[PDB]
Amino acid sequence: SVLAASKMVGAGCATIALAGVGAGLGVMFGSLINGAARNPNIAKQLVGYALLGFALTESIALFSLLVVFLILFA
Amino acid sequence: GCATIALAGVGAGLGVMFGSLINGAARNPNIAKQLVGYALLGFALTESIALFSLLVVFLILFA
Amino acid sequence: SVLAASKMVGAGCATIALAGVGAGLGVMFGSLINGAARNPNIAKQLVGYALLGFALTESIALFSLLVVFLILFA
Amino acid sequence: GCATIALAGVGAGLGVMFGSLINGAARNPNIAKQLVGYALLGFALTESIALFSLLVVFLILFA
Amino acid sequence: SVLAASKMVGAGCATIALAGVGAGLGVMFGSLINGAARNPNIAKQLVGYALLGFALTESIALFSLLVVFLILFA
Amino acid sequence: SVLAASKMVGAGCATIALAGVGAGLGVMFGSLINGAARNPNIAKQLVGYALLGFALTESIALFSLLVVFLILFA
Amino acid sequence: SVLAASKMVGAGCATIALAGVGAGLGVMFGSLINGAARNPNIAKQLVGYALLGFALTESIALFSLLVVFLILFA
Amino acid sequence: SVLAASKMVGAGCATIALAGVGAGLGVMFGSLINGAARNPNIAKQLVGYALLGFALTESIALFSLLVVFLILFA
Amino acid sequence: SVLAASKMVGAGCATIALAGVGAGLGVMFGSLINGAARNPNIAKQLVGYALLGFALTESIALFSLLVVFLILFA
Amino acid sequence: SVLAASKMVGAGCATIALAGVGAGLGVMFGSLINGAARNPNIAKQLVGYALLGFALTESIALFSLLVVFLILFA
Amino acid sequence: APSGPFYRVAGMSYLRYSNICADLLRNVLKEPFKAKAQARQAIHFRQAPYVDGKAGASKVYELENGIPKTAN
Amino acid sequence: SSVRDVKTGSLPTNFLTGVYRFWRSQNPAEKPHDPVNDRLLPAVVDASDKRASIGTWATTFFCTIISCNLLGLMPFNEAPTSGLGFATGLGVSVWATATILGLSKTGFKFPFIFVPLETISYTFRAVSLGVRLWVNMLAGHTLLHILTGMALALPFSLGFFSMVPATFGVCCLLSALVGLEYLVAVLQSGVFSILSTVYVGEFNHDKFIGPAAKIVK
Amino acid sequence: SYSAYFAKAGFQFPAGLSALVAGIVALNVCTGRPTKGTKEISNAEYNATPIGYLQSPDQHPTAFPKVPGMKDVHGSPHHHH
Amino acid sequence: PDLLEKQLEDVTGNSLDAYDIEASHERSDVLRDLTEFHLGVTLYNAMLENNCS
Amino acid sequence: EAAAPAGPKEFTEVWNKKAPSTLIVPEFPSNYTAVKAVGEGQVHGDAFPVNFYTPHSILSQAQKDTVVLPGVDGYFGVKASHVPTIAQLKPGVVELHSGAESEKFFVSGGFAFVHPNGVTDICVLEAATLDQVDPAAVKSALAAASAAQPTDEFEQAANRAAIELYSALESAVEAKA
Amino acid sequence: MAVTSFLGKAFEKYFYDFSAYEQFGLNRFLSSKGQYVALRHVGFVMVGVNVLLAANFPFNPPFPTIGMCPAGWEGTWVCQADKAKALEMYKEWKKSN
Numbered sequence A, C, E, F, G, H, I, J: 001s002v003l004a005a006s007k008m009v010g011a012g013c014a015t016i017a018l019a020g021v022g023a024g025l026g027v028m029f030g031s032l033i034n035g036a037a038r039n040p041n042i043a044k045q046l047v048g049y050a051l052l053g054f055a056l057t058e059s060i061a062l063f064s065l066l067v068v069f070l071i072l073f074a
Numbered sequence B, D: 001g002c003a004t005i006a007l008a009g010v011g012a013g014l015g016v017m018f019g020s021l022i023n024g025a026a027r028n029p030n031i032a033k034q035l036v037g038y039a040l041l042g043f044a045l046t047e048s049i050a051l052f053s054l055l056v057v058f059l060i061l062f063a
Numbered sequence K: 001a002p003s004g005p006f007y008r009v010a011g012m013s014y015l016r017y018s019n020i021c022a023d024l025l026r027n028v029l030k031e032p033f034k035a036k037a038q039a040r041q042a043i044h045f046r047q048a049p050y051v052d053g054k055a056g057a058s059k060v061y062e063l064e065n066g067i068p069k070t071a072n
Numbered sequence L: 001s002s003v004r005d006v007k008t009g010s011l012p013t014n015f016l017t018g019v020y021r022f023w024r025s026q027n028p029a030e031k032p033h034d035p036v037n038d039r040l041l042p043a044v045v046d047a048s049d050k051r052a053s054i055g056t057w058a059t060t061f062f063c064t065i066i067s068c069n070l071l072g073l074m075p076f077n078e079a080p081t082s083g084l085g086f087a088t089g090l091g092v093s094v095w096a097t098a099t100i101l102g103l104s105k106t107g108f109k110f111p112f113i114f115v116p117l118e119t120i121s122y123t124f125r126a127v128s129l130g131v132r133l134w135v136n137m138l139a140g141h142t143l144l145h146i147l148t149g150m151a152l153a154l155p156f157s158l159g160f161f162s163m164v165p166a167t168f169g170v171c172c173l174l175s176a177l178v179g180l181e182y183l184v185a186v187l188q189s190g191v192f193s194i195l196s197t198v199y200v201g202e203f204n205h206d207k208f209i210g211p212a213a214k215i216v217k
Numbered sequence M: 001s002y003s004a005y006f007a008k009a010g011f012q013f014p015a016g017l018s019a020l021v022a023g024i025v026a027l028n029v030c031t032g033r034p035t036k037g038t039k040e041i042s043n044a045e046y047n048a049t050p051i052g053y054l055q056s057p058d059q060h061p062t063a064f065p066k067v068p069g070m071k072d073v074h075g076s077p078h079h080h081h
Numbered sequence N: 001p002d003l004l005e006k007q008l009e010d011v012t013g014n015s016l017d018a019y020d021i022e023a024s025h026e027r028s029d030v031l032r033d034l035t036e037f038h039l040g041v042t043l044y045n046a047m048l049e050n051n052c053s
Numbered sequence O: 001e002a003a004a005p006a007g008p009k010e011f012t013e014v015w016n017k018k019a020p021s022t023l024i025v026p027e028f029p030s031n032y033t034a035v036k037a038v039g040e041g042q043v044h045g046d047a048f049p050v051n052f053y054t055p056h057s058i059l060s061q062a063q064k065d066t067v068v069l070p071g072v073d074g075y076f077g078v079k080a081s082h083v084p085t086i087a088q089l090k091p092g093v094v095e096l097h098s099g100a101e102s103e104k105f106f107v108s109g110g111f112a113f114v115h116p117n118g119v120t121d122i123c124v125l126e127a128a129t130l131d132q133v134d135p136a137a138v139k140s141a142l143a144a145a146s147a148a149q150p151t152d153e154f155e156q157a158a159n160r161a162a163i164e165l166y167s168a169l170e171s172a173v174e175a176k177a
Numbered sequence P: 001m002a003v004t005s006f007l008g009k010a011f012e013k014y015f016y017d018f019s020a021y022e023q024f025g026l027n028r029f030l031s032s033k034g035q036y037v038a039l040r041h042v043g044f045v046m047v048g049v050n051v052l053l054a055a056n057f058p059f060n061p062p063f064p065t066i067g068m069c070p071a072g073w074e075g076t077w078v079c080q081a082d083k084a085k086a087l088e089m090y091k092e093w094k095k096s097n
Helices: A002-036 A046-072 B003-025 B032-060 C002-012 C015-038 C046-072 D003-025 D036-059 E002-038 E047-072 F002-014 F017-038 F047-070 G002-038 G040-072 H002-014 H017-038 H047-070 I002-012 I017-038 I045-070 J002-038 J047-072 K014-026 K031-037 L011-024 L041-049 L054-073 L084-104 L115-157 L164-203 M017-028 M043-048 N005-009 N027-052 O008-018 O137-145 O153-171 P006-015 P037-054 P083-096
Strands: K043-047 K059-063 O048-053 O058-060 O066-070 O075-078 O085-087 O092-097 O102-107 O112-114 O120-123 O127-129
Touching: A002 A046, A002 B003, A002 B032, A002 C002, A002 C015, A002 D003, A002 E002, A046 B032, A046 C002, A046 C015, A046 C046, A046 L115, B003 B032, B003 D003, B003 D036, B003 F017, B032 D036, C002 C015, C002 C046, C002 E002, C015 C046, C015 E002, C015 G002, C046 E002, C046 E047, C046 L115, C046 L164, D003 D036, D003 F002, D003 F017, D003 F047, D003 H017, D036 F047, E002 E047, E002 G002, E002 I017, E047 G002, E047 G040, E047 L115, E047 L164, F002 F047, F002 H002, F002 H047, F017 F047, F017 H017, F017 H047, F017 J002, F017 O075, F047 H047, G002 G040, G002 I002, G002 I017, G002 J002, G040 I002, G040 I017, G040 I045, G040 L115, H002 H047, H002 J002, H002 J047, H017 H047, H017 I017, H017 J002, H017 J047, H047 J047, I002 J002, I017 I045, I017 J002, I045 J002, I045 J047, J002 J047, K014 N027, K014 O153, L011 L054, L054 L084, L054 L115, L054 L164, L084 L115, L084 L164, L115 L164, L115 P037, L164 P037, N005 N027, O048 O092, O066 O120, O137 O153
Parallel strands: O048 O120
Antiparallel strands: K043 K059, O048 O058, O066 O075, O066 O092, O085 O112, O092 O102, O102 O127, O112 O120
């Protein structure tokens, strides 16, 4: 069973792409605080770019977990 | 074990956002009760990456 | 089955390059929040530089996934 | 051994958050104890990743 | 087929270098959003520096992809 | 002695986490200089925050030194 | 052919020196945008400092592509 | 002799923790130059903060060189 | 042929050292561009400091490139 | 001869500690450029601080190059 | 529609902003020093545009508590 | 022998006017030191005779690639620039056009250890200009093939028009990847021909002839 | 006012499209090589072989195949296996 | 502020580029703040020099 | 980029061509200050000249050893050969130290320039020492400024300036020795 | 009819004023019209996927199933992941069915 043993260690290292969208979502959400500390007037519009930036950075988490879904379950 | 190296990025990600909370509150401390409303929401949406990494560690081991 | 096991390991370590793309899309989408906090009168233009910047670094998110799928299925 | 490489990003995340505690306190020292009231809250949430990495290093080894 | 197996894992390790390109490109594309938020008066000139920089940074991404296609199919 | 061999290569990969705390101290002691170069009249309170910060990021380094010795001699 | 199988996987690890050249070039080309957004009056001189720094950082890229072409075909 | 070969490859994996200490130390020695460029009448007091930090940054670097000898010779 | 094979995968994963040399030479040549954009009066002296920084950072690249010729040909 | 074979693989992954040392020297020699662009009156004192940093960051480069030759010739 | 700090994007000049912040400091001073700071706070003048050469139309000021915090 | 009649102010005439005037603006003519009058007018006309037609070439490559890239988004059609010889054959042909222009600036003779490193990074521009167009048109279409196979696995297994919240979230992920492919189709035809003006515009420099004799004051 | 003059001439192709279509067709038929899945044989083999045995199974895939790999013809059973 | 002000310092570089700007926004934006303050200062001095004259 | 070679000395020579010859040249504000920016000197080692001004007072013009300035990024300190600086200041406390003794003025905002010859020129509007501020009525108006925020976009800034001034004024009465 | 003139006018009044966003009410459930189009789009895909599958359902899938089977098949030719195997089982099943 070298195939099923490889799809576990293959999908194991396939998930460390989530280190990037975990660290990228910190510097995007860290930028929201230093964006809101400068002008709190626009801090309800800056969430509208925070969640749009969140939705497009978790497209890569949706691609990284798709390769995990495709190595495990193809 | 190699799958949980994804938790390095959420470990480096939350330190920067909570680094921006110290520097953000040091500018105007009056908004510091709104900034944790953005820090902890930014904490929660980054912890979904922390559980997406841990959902598959409990699906590689336990599925 | 040394070949079909190797494609699952090689494609898993191929998609670790979706990390740096996800981290680059955090430092760019954070700059949309910092930029629209500087002058919010340009905030409909800086989204236009974000999504032109998103579509060109999403390209690297697909260059990486191309080798993921021509290791796995080719 | 591979499972505790996730402590690299937590240690680099913590060096940036405690780096901003120095720069935040040198930017207004009158708020310099409220920022530690934000730092150790931010430290407690980034250690949560350090124990999630160490939950795995003992669930691989002793489970 | 240990040679056929090692090309699938060698090319997967070869395409990690698209993490650094995907992260450098967001750093440059984050600068276009900030630098055009400083003075929007040269925002047609700074896109001309973003795309001169995109072209030279994604040229490194095709260096990485040529080594992928020269491992896999050569 | 395959287990005696895997404790040697496991413990070397176990101490990769001293790169991350080794760069965390370089950042935190880098802001100690930049904080003490802005207002040097607080230069004895920042070391009261740096050495509290140093001992509390070592917390991670001795957790990493825990499992370099928990797999080696246990 | 364990020698021929190792040159495929060795040349894959050799070409992720292109990751740092891919990330460093985005910092140098991000600084061209922010530098030319400060004074557009020397923006013809900063590109001459960008293309000099590009050609000396791509020398790190072609030195590691020398090692890829020296493992694969030498 | 797969134990004695495992101490060698485990030692190489052990000393990549010297990467992060090498990267933090350029941040700390870089920020003293920016620190001593602000007010150079603190430029020997900041060196007292650099070598305080460099002695604590090397603190983890020899923790890595203890482990690279404790698996090699212990 | 395992020993002759390990000259190729070892010297292959030896030259990942040129990644951070490529990333360092990017942030150093990025700091020339912002530094010369601050005051163009010093922009011929900062380049003399850039090649002081380039030739001394490359040393780490050549401290790697001897080892890839000391693993491959020694 | 897997002991002298693993000495080629172990010494290869040993010298990727010179990645971070190059990224340290690029941050450190970069901050001299911005430091001497701010006040060039101190620009001959700052090189006394960079060569203090270049020699003491190299100490990490000579700590890892010890273990490269302590694997290969010890 | 202007781009800059929070006073400048709100149409306010820096001189008005820096005098509002000068006004609000004076309201917080000690009373042996608050009333003497009320001397340098008062604004008493008048203006008149001259669109043709001799015409009229003005704006008089008999302000005591300081520069106006509201919109001009 | 009888040409067709064109309405003035048609939409394809207005689009191609703005497209041509865009790519012509990428390599602008340089202002002489002299004032442009009837003395300087043959020097300005000869300055235009020696400049390459990059305004025409770049809108040839804009209009032939955006037409090919957008064929891949029409139903029943594939993009021609998703082929390796088509897309990289346009990239080498731009690179050779720049080189033939730069070689003719002399007398067709080709230009210590530095210059093999300027050449390599210059000869890689050949393959990088075409492979960037080819891989973008290939990697976007390939991901769409894989995810349509995954999104077909759910209604094949489960019910037709049943368990619909599982397939809705992936039919909207498939729909947002075809939408990104419309953006990459327009961007990569722009990036190909922005870069064609940069590469060909490097050798687009000649000496202004100008007045050799003057009557001052 | 001139709107009815432009409705008179209807659709018209671009003004040299017959040279594009005759240039793309002349590249796809003047290949100078056999026609993608076929091989040139001698006349003695072509006159001696049935048209069911000249056909290969790979060149006739099933028009909507129920199993991936179904072919419509089966070709020569005289394999050289 | 830059309608002529930086345009008169910028000879073989700039005379104003020696200073490290510590403002919130751009240098062209702090000079907008800084010359109105230079206008109000030298006006306050003018009608105080003139009144004592 | 050098279309107008202006200056005080140039204005004298051209004004003799358009004005009557009876009138002597008007004076200029360069003729009343002896301290320049690019003129080399004026540091003298440890203590550097600090010109802390208001419109209505010259609060200091002797030399100090360090000045804690309340910049908009944060509180920074100036030593003698500091980098040239144009620093917009927040409402905060300017600390003038001479040695062991320090005087603490709370200012309302207004710039501070460090010139290339080491001369610091703090330029604020209202510079009250904290000895003459009372800590009672500061929050009496800050609580009112924390309540009254209408949709007036001019009072959007003026209340923002009201809040950040008292808030820094709250925090800078608490830590006095 | 005139073959180019009838249904051009029929498609015109199907394109323009025929609107099921208002003729079927549907403002009660949907916020804008920009999100009625954004799920008529996804509705067109889900309908078109379910029509293309059902119009020839007994087929061995070229795409990878994820370890799932359609109905009561589960070991037949429809779910067989080896294609030369399932060609043999389909030819046996076709004589019976």
